[PDB]
mmCIF file of C-alpha atoms in Angstrom:
data_model
loop_
_atom_site.group_PDB
_atom_site.id
_atom_site.type_symbol
_atom_site.label_atom_id
_atom_site.label_comp_id
_atom_site.label_asym_id
_atom_site.label_seq_id
_atom_site.Cartn_x
_atom_site.Cartn_y
_atom_site.Cartn_z
ATOM 1 C CA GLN A 22 49.944 -125.354 -56.651
ATOM 2 C CA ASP A 23 49.310 -126.016 -52.935
ATOM 3 C CA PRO A 24 47.572 -129.321 -52.113
ATOM 4 C CA UNK A 25 44.009 -128.895 -50.548
ATOM 5 C CA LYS A 26 44.072 -125.070 -50.890
ATOM 6 C CA UNK A 27 44.685 -124.577 -54.585
ATOM 7 C CA UNK A 28 47.088 -122.845 -56.983
#
């Protein structure tokens, strides 16, 4: 759920 990274 973290922008650019993922989740």
